Amino acid sequence: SQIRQNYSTEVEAAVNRLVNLYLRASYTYLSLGFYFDRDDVALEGVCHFFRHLAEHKREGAERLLKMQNQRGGRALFQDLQKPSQDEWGTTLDAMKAAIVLEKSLNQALLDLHALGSAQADPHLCDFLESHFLDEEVKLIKKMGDHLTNIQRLVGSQAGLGEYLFERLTLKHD
Amino acid sequence: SQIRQNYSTEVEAAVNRLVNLYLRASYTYLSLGFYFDRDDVALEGVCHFFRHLAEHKREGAERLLKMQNQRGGRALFQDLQKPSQDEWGTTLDAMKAAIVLEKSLNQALLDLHALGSAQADPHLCDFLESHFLDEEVKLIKKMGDHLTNIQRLVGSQAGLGEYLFERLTLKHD
Amino acid sequence: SQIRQNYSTEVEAAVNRLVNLYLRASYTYLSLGFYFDRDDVALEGVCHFFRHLAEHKREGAERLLKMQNQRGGRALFQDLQKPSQDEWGTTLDAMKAAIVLEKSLNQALLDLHALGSAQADPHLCDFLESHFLDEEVKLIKKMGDHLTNIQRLVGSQAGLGEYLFERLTLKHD
Amino acid sequence: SQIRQNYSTEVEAAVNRLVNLYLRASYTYLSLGFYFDRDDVALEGVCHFFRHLAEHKREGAERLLKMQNQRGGRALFQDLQKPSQDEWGTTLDAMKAAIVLEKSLNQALLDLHALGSAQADPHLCDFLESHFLDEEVKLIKKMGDHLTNIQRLVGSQAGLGEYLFERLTLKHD
Ligand SMILES: [Cl-]
Ligand SMILES: [Cl-]
Numbered sequence A, B, C, D: 001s002q003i004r005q006n007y008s009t010e011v012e013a014a015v016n017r018l019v020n021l022y023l024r025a026s027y028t029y030l031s032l033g034f035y036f037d038r039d040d041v042a043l044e045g046v047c048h049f050f051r052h053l054a055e056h057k058r059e060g061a062e063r064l065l066k067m068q069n070q071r072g073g074r075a076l077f078q079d080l081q082k083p084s085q086d087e088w089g090t091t092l093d094a095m096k097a098a099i100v101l102e103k104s105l106n107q108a109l110l111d112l113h114a115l116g117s118a119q120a121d122p123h124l125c126d127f128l129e130s131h132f133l134d135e136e137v138k139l140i141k142k143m144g145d146h147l148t149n150i151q152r153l154v155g156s157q158a159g160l161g162e163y164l165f166e167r168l169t170l171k172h173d
């Protein structure tokens, strides 16, 4: 490569794996979004919350792919596994599955940062710090806040709580 | 007729029957709308939901009547039967009766489309596709979404659920 | 299902398969787009042409998923296979692979239309006519036009032709 | 020094050397810019490309000098060596010399970052990450893209390719 400098094969490979993890996450959120649009689920604010995350995770994958080319690495795509579930349960089940998914993406980012640190690759380390690590902390804090509110609302009338959370906390229209 | 071309007597008759079905549906929705405006029912958002459908079904009848004249058929009006009920129960009873009514209109549209297909009448088939079939799918999906939300809200406090659905889902002012 | 009417299990299944075909096509175009952004390929107009198609095919999948829910079918996601190639050759190789891909999507749309016709499902038939069949004819005509222009430009100076096509026909900036 | 804190003599010296490297690079680009403005070379877009880099490298030197004073180090200027060539050959020769020059600046930045990491100087490390490392990756990717396009255009008509690259890729007016 005419441009590649200080870019390890180990980072190049890990970036291709992280692209696969982000695209899998996007696909998971696409499935969650359409599940909440079902006529027998019908929680618009929950649908919009997950559809937006599907778009955001796709954008993350595209930013990693642009950076791979900027550093002179080569994008390599793999099979994308289907989401872990076909039906996602309650808003609470779905938000618990989301925070697990985000913790797994966050650990993949921290692992890649640690590899870049070990490889003395400060451009890679800056890149994750600037575009991913704080977006992930912010998102996990928001999901933690939502879990608390959902849990408060279950009480002895789960249906009423699920409706009120979607109407008064999540964005709809 | 100076203009009639490729327009069967069977379609002409079925169009006059469908006009009667749309006007009956409008009359049903007029009755539902004023029932929810009663001082002892008093659910404004439910009143507005049904009053709007009464106007929309009337407009459907008028579009069929305009098309009948465009094709050189002859409008023929019949007695309009009164709605099936004088009092419509809860929001849930009313929304269940509406989705039954819409399924019956949808089947009448599909039956007429099938007659036009059999008669090789593509103008009739286009007309239903363009102005009725998707409006009906969209409306039945919305009523299905509302039924799910109403059902979630019944819990052990039916009155509270009926008020919250009308205040937080349906349009009022 | 509370809303499902005149929607066959055969169409529901074929719609889920077509969603998989559109998402595979999006993934293929994502791979083509980033290949042309490589520093050793560096054809910006070709990159932008394929990146846009990746977005358009994703939007097609999302429209099919919305329609599946409108009809009361159930979205079911499968594993997404990786693209057929890791490296895509010349602009000409890439545009030949694209038109093959589009012909396969077009045949899948025509097959689904034929199934809906056989099932007397005019809403499905309208839906494909209105949002997919002409978009596909328009795209295949544009790719055919581009193939002719690329082929004219190969001459005895392939590099010069590939540069001029990307600079004077495709959109860049 | 009244302000100096956590700023090693090793970093202070390396910053003064890097200022010399940036000013030498500016001087090199000044020479490349005026060579392409010669009446017997006359490639305006190539002239403008290098004149702009001369200004950008000067600005890099000035940012390092401002930071040296912010940290309480002392600017020390050395003799500036003349550029390596008086005449720069073809656009291709010039762009190959530029990417070599940029790789040498990039390695000097990475070396200084590594020194700051070893000295536990996070302000220095942030400073390079924020203002230099990604500017350098972006520039080397752009020069790699240009090299590919120039190389594609040499064919058997080098003059025609050199003119078309300057007219259709580089900015002129
Ligand atoms: Cl799997
Ligand atoms: Cl009667």
Ligand SMILES: [Cl-]
Pocket (backbone or CB within 6 Å): C081, C082
């Ligand atoms: Cl495969």
Ligand SMILES: [Cl-]
Pocket (backbone or CB within 6 Å): D081, D082
């Ligand atoms: Cl010298």
